[PDB]
Symmetry: D2
Subunit: 331 residues, 4 copies
């Protein structure tokens, strides 16, 4: 018994969610919606500059997508309320347009025949957020949920291990983040973010982010203890969090490493990773773990003040955990 998913929005997250769903036997994509001709959708799925060619076959026949022998209904509806999700039997909608990030706009999917909605971004309202490895057991049957952000999915699991084992007094984070679709190729207008309109490939671009402060929502014990900011850098994919934290209980770096390794090999096997290799960003292109702890890159000034490094494929890891949230609220 497979969970039937419709994808609203075939951007970066929507397409990588689709690609990850082909690998999972418990989740099935049955419908895609975006303002794109079916033939265009096949082209964007077939070819990916970041993640290579689609592993499988995609073709178009009679206005529908054929993906590995499976028929995908393709629609181009602007109003989510006329999506007729019930006609294809969709259980959960992966709302991935980045535009309907509130309970009232996203509820239009449930009106249109869907049973539940997962937002592939942090909610602009109080729609509950859930990060795997952090607070999945706190889901209480809500029909609209958020998977938070790609950056929160990296910070929250690492934060839990550190807090549970040593107690975080206070932490400040920087994410050295890859270029995203909202940026510009050359200096251009970006009214909502002047820095973000500067040429992405030429610049280190500071930006603000609530992802660190949002960790206090999925980890309420850390409610007012985390914040930070971002540096957008000229990479097509893969980012890394730089977490400077104060510890209540004194810990050697060797003890931090052992605590992370244990959680990575234990309760967070699929979410948190651990490495001692001389890794660089491209080594995590395709990583499913939302947080891979970089043991050698981190550094401690003393037993209570430490800087911790954790990688994440902001496309693949987040997309896989979107599916984890789909299945968690269904299974």
């Amino acid at each position: 018994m497979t969970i039937k998913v419709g994808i609203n929005g075939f951007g970066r997250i929507g397409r990588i969610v689709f690609r990850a769903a082909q690998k999972r036997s418990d989740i099935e994509i049955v419908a895609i919606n975006d303002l794109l001709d079916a033939e265009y959708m096949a082209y964007m799925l077939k070819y990916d500059s970041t993640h290579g060619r689609f592993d499988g076959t995609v073709e178009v026949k009679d206005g529908h997508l054929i993906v590995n022998g499976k028929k995908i209904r393709v629609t181009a509806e602007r109003d989510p309320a006329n999506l007729k999700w019930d006609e294809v039997g969709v259980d959960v909608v992966a709302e991935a347009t980045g535009i309907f990030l509130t309970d009232e706009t996203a509820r239009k999917h449930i009106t249109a025949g869907a049973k539940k909605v997962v937002l592939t971004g942090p909610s602009k309202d109080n729609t509950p957020m859930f990060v795997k490895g952090a607070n999945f057991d706190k889901y209480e049957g809500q029909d609209i949920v958020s998977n938070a952000s790609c950056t929160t999915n990296c910070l929250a699991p690492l934060a839990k291990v550190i807090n549970d084992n040593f107690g975080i007094i206070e932490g400040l984070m920087t994410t050295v983040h890859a270029t995203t679709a909202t940026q510009k190729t050359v200096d251009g207008p970006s009214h909502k973010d002047w820095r973000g309109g500067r040429g992405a490939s030429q610049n280190i671009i500071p930006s603000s982010t609530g992802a660190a402060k949002a960790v206090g929502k999925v980890l309420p014990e850390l409610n007012g203890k985390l914040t930070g900011m971002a540096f957008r850098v000229p990479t097509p994919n893969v980012s890394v969090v730089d977490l400077t934290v104060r510890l209540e209980k004194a810990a050697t770096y060797e003890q931090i490493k052992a605590a992370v390794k244990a959680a990575a090999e234990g309760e967070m096997k699929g979410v948190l990773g651990y490495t001692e290799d001389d890794v660089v960003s491209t080594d995590f292109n395709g990583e499913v773990c939302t947080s891979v702890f970089d043991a050698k890159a981190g550094i401690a000034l003393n037993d209570n003040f430490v800087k911790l490094v954790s990688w994440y494929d902001n496309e693949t890891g987040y997309s896989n955990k979107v599916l984890d949230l789909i299945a968690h609220i269904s299974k």
Copy 2:
């Protein structure tokens, strides 16, 4: 007596035209129009990732731009017909939105009080095109003209020298072109150009262009003898034409070089350049010549089949020649 110019569109070309106008004593910018707050316009003019900080001072006072002590009227009108160009005494409008590239849409500037219009792109209709070094003496008083494209401004002057001296039988051109504002930072929708929606910084992107065929419009003797295509590459600025030509009159490469050098030091001093240095693309960031012939990069198979290389700052060179066309149809 200075020519008063209004700029419609403060994109890449509009801002570099503005910067080039500060260096010319015969051209004055008196008004800028775009859908941008005056403070934002000052920011985009102050800071340029490609060309550095503005050489001078820019500030905003009472909704107006103050640039080196000069007041610039700033408007944000969508309809070019309500631009009230006559209120600021604009003679010529540099139409640089890339959107009103036809006589009927651009004529709205003349209705709005302007006397003449220069399109900073190739016309979508038959609005006459003029390239400096090619056909400025063919201007016959038209009130709406086009400066063609940045690529045509590189190919046309070099084509004239080669044709005048040796006779071009036929030529095929490739422009290895820098990233432009129409491209995307990561794989994304570009309905009018699927290749152009792929991540600009990751890819060599083939594209079509009429710039070579357009040379037959500014150089009618070459009407059906030139065409070609483009490769978009991950550079923020500066492009280069790769011209493979057949010659009627046999010429050694030394004779081609001498003919180009003579025209560069003679009738085309400001338009066509010549170098024998080991130049790379960044060496022409800020180049005013629309075509700098790369002597060492070119290669000949024989005396009638030769490949010629010419650089151009697709932002600075074209912007300077836009001003040359403004002044030519006024002076």
Copy 3:
């Protein structure tokens, strides 16, 4: 099965090794470079361009264990003391870029190898062979060259065009990705001043012999082609830009069909064909040494045409090195 030793673990040496894991007829048994097993395992495990190694890598007693196979690791400068016969090497993939002649490569045969394939164009008259071009012209030579990555893209396309329409004369440009010889920022490069400028900032003109080398593997094209290159800020994948004059007048649609027919026929696996809106990254990992881009090309008339063909200058060339190894071992 052919037992292969790789001399030189650079870009070509490492991608050849990765490609060899997919073929059941070729197995790598020894690697030689001045690098030591622990570093080699790291470079093989992690690749910025082609992702993580598909399989398992570990180090044991100064040797590599790769997918359960023990690889001898040596660091010998003189190929004559490489003791290839002690590890049973049949063919040597000479990939240092340094021993590109019959006399230096003969030291591999001296050290116990049977045949040698140079992963570059020969500096002497060592015969060159390109798949799809002249593999049938092999006459049992024990030292051969696989030419260059650019030649492996131009030669198959050139053959189809010449065989079908007759090339009078052609000029080629390869828009080429950044390579290891370039610098990250403006720096000294005595042998090529342009090449020392910052690779990531620049379109850099550079020289190439690949077009005239096509006249060696396709003697009918001797002295009919030349050209040059532009190195551009991409990590991998290049494309040839071939402007040619044709004897027999042909519409561009007729050119397309002739290439497609050869891609689906006599050159399957060597030459590819597409009408899709492809970009460079779509060929990262391409096995075909030449994929014809139908939509990118353009014709001025029926006798003057510009033809575009992609190639992964790492993967495609590396696979054909193995293709030549197996061909000279039959």
Copy 4:
């Protein structure tokens, strides 16, 4: 006027030379590197990062004529045979990155120079001086170090923060541009495996001593700071990310005012201040070694804050090398 010879014509050596043309108190009279005049003129003429040389460059009798001034060009490996007194060199800008100790740099004084400034952090106890930090602590030493480009950014900001609020402890990250030590594609780097990966593709963690070196130029901060770096695919301009604990509680607005006051006061020209939506390229050519980014920083509370400061790791550091030359010559 101070007559300067530059040993080493790399990135720092060439940008120091360009910066010296703007100052009337310092003139370059000799350059030494294994490069020859014709190449040096080319590298000086054309720069991918900073544009064409502002002025005229030509070669005459193996020597450089730059803006009408004759520059002696030598290619001496041993600094003791550099004959600095024959060209009247007062101070030597030691910029090879190779002679970073009192005993190797003393060979310059042996060869006729009066004083030496190393354009890097000393490997021995050669005193380090950062403008805005401890220039007033110079006691006439003939060999000094200007520390690193990153130290020149952290030390002035650290001083303002410590002087005003008291730093208990700080951890710093510098998001740093690509440098000449990196590779264009995955390649051998024995001394730093991460550093051999393709610079243009990767965020690359790397080490840095710049934070602890701040404890040397600001002894009050001894053992209170450490950190590391991420090398990113930009050709130039870097930024320090300083997370600090403060003794005296301060709102972020109070921190901003304290930095702005110092930037407009005692550290004018060294420390800068902005509230604009700046990005890295806005500081390509910046003379200030540290420009505080008010909007980029963020505070968790009045005692735990993250501070952002930009630096052109080429231009800013190069200007302060000349600033140290002139300070030790007074």
